[PDB]
């Protein structure tokens, strides 16, 4: 569960400015109409307490290259029966009638259902996969309030970091696409905050950073 080189180094660099966080925040114009971005906090959205409804919202920026990491703050008691976090194309539906793991339900999105600890992608046709893989006896892995999402558009992978622990590659095959951060929620009044952490080009990293990484090990 050791963070791969690039991720570790990116996480040791200074977090993206307040300006960058806003540029990569939730898109108030690309959302389910049961969700609204907080006027007093553009990095956080609020879901209306609508019964039998699953709702999503996409981030403003679709990523096509480079390594990108963003932090999700989702209060554990505001998740309910279906809380999913991941990425999707511009075509993934943002709303669904009924409670379900919307993100990852079609080939248009990839997501980690926090409660079931299941990875979903085109789930109507492909079964979910347990994640982290080390779980046994269908035991729950409680994802805390905050955790990190790492999207590497160079290698085409998606992975998550919890409590500083890398949980491994979740999805592969994302190269060549334009992906947006997304979550599907069913909890009345839940508020999810997304803070862009940083981005890293696929170029040789400075020796200084490489050394500090080896030392942190």
């Amino acid at each position: 569960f050791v963070k791969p080189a690039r991720i570790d180094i990116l996480l040791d660099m200074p977090p993206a400015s307040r300006d960058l966080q806003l540029k990569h925040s939730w898109n108030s114009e690309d959302r389910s109409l049961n969700i609204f971005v907080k006027e007093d906090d553009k990095l956080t959205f609020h879901r209306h307490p609508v019964a039998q409804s699953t709702d999503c919202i996409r981030g403003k920026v679709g990523l096509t290259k480079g390594l990108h990491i963003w932090e999700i703050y989702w209060p554990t008691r505001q998740r309910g029966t279906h809380a999913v976090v991941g990425v999707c194309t511009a075509d993934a539906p943002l709303h669904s009638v009924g409670y379900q793991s919307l993100v990852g339900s079609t080939e248009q999105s990839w997501g980690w259902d926090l409660g079931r600890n299941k990875l979903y992608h085109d789930s109507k046709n492909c079964a979910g996969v347990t994640y982290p893989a080390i779980l046994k006896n269908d035991e729950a892995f409680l994802v805390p309030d905050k955790f990190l999402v790492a999207l590497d558009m160079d290698e085409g992978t998606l992975s998550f970091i919890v409590d500083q622990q890398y949980l491994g590659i979740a999805f592969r095959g994302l190269r060549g696409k334009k992906l947006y951060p997304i979550v599907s929620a069913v909890w009345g009044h839940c508020e999810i905050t997304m803070r862009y952490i940083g981005g890293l080009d696929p170029e040789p990293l400075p020796l200084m950073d490489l050394c500090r990484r080896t030392i942190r090990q």
Binding site: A5, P204, L207, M208, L210, C211, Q217
Partner: protein
């Protein structure tokens, strides 16, 4: 074309000038307002540094998957001090 980088213990490393410019410090020393001598960087560290120069130039000017730059735990601390000093 080439420049000579000399370690504290007297090893002379002959590297392509463009490669040596990977280091902000060496770049500045080669400009001014030939050789470069290092009082506190020993050969086992300077040699590693030169390999980094080769690595950096080769993979910065390419779109092919960049491999890992090997750094043994034993040298990491000395390498770090050298990297900071050389700005690279």
């Amino acid at each position: 074309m080439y420049v000579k980088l000399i370690s504290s213990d007297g090893h002379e490393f002959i590297v392509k000038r463009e490669h040596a410019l990977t280091s902000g410090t060496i770049k500045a020393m080669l400009s001014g307002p030939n050789e470069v001598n290092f009082r506190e960087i020993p050969s086992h560290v300077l040699s590693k540094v030169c390999m980094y120069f080769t690595y950096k130039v080769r993979y910065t000017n390419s779109s092919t998957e960049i491999p890992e730059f090997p750094i043994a735990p034993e040298i990491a601390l000395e390498l770090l001090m050298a990297a900071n000093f050389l700005d690279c």
